[PDB]
Amino acid sequence: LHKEPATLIKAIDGDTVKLMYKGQPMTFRLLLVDTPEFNEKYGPEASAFTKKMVENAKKIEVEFDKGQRTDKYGRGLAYTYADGKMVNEALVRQGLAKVAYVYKGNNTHEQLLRKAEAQAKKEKLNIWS
């Protein structure tokens, strides 16, 4: 997999963000995770967390997996990085997302995120409290 540049346009919620990719505005849906909706428990904390992460980054990168790069809503499907730190993994490690939506071919970082979920659950963090 390879990291590609992108620039923040706008935080959206815990697992979507608006980024400019190859000069085009795009909504990105974070691979392999599921945050609560803003209106659900830990929803606002997940949105806040992703928002701070992406707004504070001096460098945003997106990394597509081997399978589909857009979903049925035309959202990009990527692993997204804030100054070298994966947002997808960070959310899971903090217990603000579950590993989810694991589809064959777009699952390179599955066991990295499952490892993070196991540690968040061990710590009873947030969703696992």
Ligand SMILES: Cc1cn([C@H]2C[C@H](OP(=O)(O)O)[C@@H](COP(=O)(O)O)O2)c(=O)[nH]c1=O
């Ligand atoms: C993460 C991800 C979501 N999706 C689609 C599946 C779900 O379909 P449905 O909308 O029919 O439930 C939806 C969940 O995204 P949200 O969690 O953003 O709602 O997005 C993909 O198709 N591929 C993916 O990799």
Ligand SMILES: [Ca+2]
């Ligand atoms: Ca969600």
